[PDB]
Design a protein around this motif. Structure first.
Motif, PDB file in Angstrom:
ATOM      1  N   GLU B   4      55.738  31.981  32.816  1.00  0.00           N
ATOM      2  CA  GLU B   4      55.554  32.639  31.495  1.00  0.00           C
ATOM      3  C   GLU B   4      56.434  31.956  30.452  1.00  0.00           C
ATOM      4  O   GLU B   4      55.974  31.819  29.311  1.00  0.00           O
ATOM      5  N   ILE B   7      54.635  28.773  29.478  1.00  0.00           N
ATOM      6  CA  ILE B   7      53.400  29.140  28.729  1.00  0.00           C
ATOM      7  C   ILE B   7      53.794  29.522  27.299  1.00  0.00           C
ATOM      8  O   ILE B   7      53.210  28.979  26.354  1.00  0.00           O
ATOM      9  N   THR B  22      44.049  34.201  25.220  1.00  0.00           N
ATOM     10  CA  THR B  22      43.107  34.740  26.236  1.00  0.00           C
ATOM     11  C   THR B  22      42.614  33.603  27.133  1.00  0.00           C
ATOM     12  O   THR B  22      42.820  33.687  28.354  1.00  0.00           O
ATOM     13  N   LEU B  25      45.635  31.061  28.805  1.00  0.00           N
ATOM     14  CA  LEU B  25      46.666  31.697  29.662  1.00  0.00           C
ATOM     15  C   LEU B  25      46.368  31.474  31.152  1.00  0.00           C
ATOM     16  O   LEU B  25      47.212  30.937  31.867  1.00  0.00           O
ATOM     17  N   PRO B  26      45.183  31.859  31.689  1.00  0.00           N
ATOM     18  CA  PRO B  26      44.902  31.693  33.119  1.00  0.00           C
ATOM     19  C   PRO B  26      44.855  30.229  33.586  1.00  0.00           C
ATOM     20  O   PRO B  26      45.248  29.952  34.696  1.00  0.00           O
ATOM     21  N   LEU B  27      44.374  29.333  32.723  1.00  0.00           N
ATOM     22  CA  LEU B  27      44.282  27.877  32.998  1.00  0.00           C
ATOM     23  C   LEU B  27      45.691  27.294  33.129  1.00  0.00           C
ATOM     24  O   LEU B  27      45.945  26.570  34.103  1.00  0.00           O
ATOM     25  N   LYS B  29      48.466  28.907  33.813  1.00  0.00           N
ATOM     26  CA  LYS B  29      49.085  29.516  35.019  1.00  0.00           C
ATOM     27  C   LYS B  29      48.700  28.711  36.265  1.00  0.00           C
ATOM     28  O   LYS B  29      49.586  28.412  37.060  1.00  0.00           O
ATOM     29  N   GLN B  30      47.425  28.369  36.428  1.00  0.00           N
ATOM     30  CA  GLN B  30      46.943  27.574  37.589  1.00  0.00           C
ATOM     31  C   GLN B  30      47.689  26.241  37.637  1.00  0.00           C
ATOM     32  O   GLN B  30      48.269  25.929  38.681  1.00  0.00           O
ATOM     33  N   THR B  33      51.596  26.041  38.371  1.00  0.00           N
ATOM     34  CA  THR B  33      51.953  26.293  39.792  1.00  0.00           C
ATOM     35  C   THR B  33      51.588  25.056  40.633  1.00  0.00           C
ATOM     36  O   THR B  33      52.038  24.969  41.799  1.00  0.00           O
ATOM     37  N   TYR B  35      48.350  24.396  41.184  1.00  0.00           N
ATOM     38  CA  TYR B  35      47.010  24.793  41.704  1.00  0.00           C
ATOM     39  C   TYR B  35      45.918  24.176  40.809  1.00  0.00           C
ATOM     40  O   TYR B  35      45.232  24.911  40.053  1.00  0.00           O
ATOM     41  N   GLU B  38      41.273  24.075  41.677  1.00  0.00           N
ATOM     42  CA  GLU B  38      40.293  25.012  41.059  1.00  0.00           C
ATOM     43  C   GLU B  38      39.779  24.460  39.719  1.00  0.00           C
ATOM     44  O   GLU B  38      38.655  24.852  39.341  1.00  0.00           O
ATOM     45  N   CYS B 118      40.584  24.599  24.531  1.00  0.00           N
ATOM     46  CA  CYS B 118      40.736  25.978  23.992  1.00  0.00           C
ATOM     47  C   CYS B 118      40.839  25.985  22.465  1.00  0.00           C
ATOM     48  O   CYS B 118      40.274  26.915  21.858  1.00  0.00           O
TER      49      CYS B 118
END
Lengths: 146, 142
Positions: B4, B7, B22, B25-27, B29-30, B33, B35, B38, B118
Motif C-alpha cells: 500500500e 501504491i 479503481t 489498484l489490483p494490477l 498489487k499483483q 508482490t 505475481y 496473471e 489506466c
C-alpha cells in the motif's frame, strides 16, 4: 487545393475516437493546412516532426503488444528493430494516402512525422495507432511469413 | 514497508486532482508482490519500456524546446536503456534491493505499463519527469 483538401480528408478518414466516431477536426485542420501549404515554418516551436517520430515508435510497440501478445517480448523487440527507421512503413502509408509518388525518403519521413505529431497533439496516441495500423500489421505479417 | 505504501507513492506522483485508483489498484498489487504470471497477456513490461522512451521524448520537446531536434536526439540516445533513470526512480519510491537487479527495471516497466493503460501517457510523463529532467540538466550542465 482540391488535391490538398482531398489529402487532408484522407488523413481524417483514418482517425476515429474510442467509440469509432469521427474526431473533432477543429484543432488539426489549420495545423495540417500550415504544414501542407505554408511556404515558411510557422509551427517549428511545436516540434511536431520530433514528437511524430517518437509517437510512431510507441504506436508500433502498442500494435505488437495488442496483435502479437502470444510472442516473447524479445521476439516483438526483434520485429520492432526492423522499423527503428520506418521508411518501408512510410512508403506504404504514402502510397495508400496518394502522397507524391516520387518523393525523396527524408522529405517523405519528415512530412509523415509532422502529420503524426499533429494527430498525437490533437487526439493522442490512438490517432497515431489508427493512422499506421493497417500498413504496419501487413508488414509485420510479411516479416513473420519470412 | 507495505504494498500500500508503494501504491500510494506511485499514485501521489500522477495527479493536483486525484486519479480514480479503481482500475490500477489490483494490477499494482499483483506486480508489486511479483505475481506477474496473471498479467502476462497484458504485456505491461513491454508497453512500459516503450512508454518510458516516448515520455522522455515528450519531456525533451516540452522542456528543452529551444534546442535543435539534433541536440534533443543526441540527449535521448543516452537514455536508450535508461538504467540511471530506473535507479533514481526506484530510490525515490523506496523500492528495496531485489534478489537480482533485473527485477528493478521489470517492476518499474510494469508500473509504467499499468499507468499508461489506466491513465494514458500523461501519467507516465508525470511519473518520470522530475528524475529525467534532473539527469538531462546534469547532461546539459556537464
Amino acid at each position: 487545393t482540391d488535391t490538398v483538401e482531398q489529402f487532408i480528408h484522407t488523413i481524417f478518414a483514418r482517425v476515429t475516437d474510442d467509440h469509432g466516431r469521427p474526431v473533432d477536426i477543429t484543432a488539426a485542420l489549420p495545423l495540417l493546412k500550415q504544414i501542407l501549404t505554408g511556404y515558411t515554418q510557422e509551427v517549428a516551436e511545436h516540434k511536431f516532426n520530433y514528437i511524430g517520430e517518437s509517437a510512431v515508435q510507441f504506436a508500433m510497440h502498442l500494435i505488437l503488444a495488442d496483435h502479437f501478445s502470444k510472442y516473447e517480448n524479445g521476439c516483438l523487440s526483434a520485429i520492432a528493430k526492423k522499423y527503428t527507421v520506418p521508411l518501408q512503413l512510410y512508403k506504404l502509408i504514402g502510397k495508400q494516402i496518394h502522397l507524391k509518388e516520387y518523393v525523396r525518403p527524408v522529405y517523405l519521413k519528415e512530412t509523415l512525422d509532422m502529420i503524426v505529431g499533429i494527430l498525437f497533439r490533437c487526439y493522442g496516441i490512438t490517432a497515431v495507432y489508427k493512422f499506421i495500423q493497417e500498413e504496419f500489421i501487413l508488414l509485420v505479417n510479411q516479416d513473420i511469413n519470412n
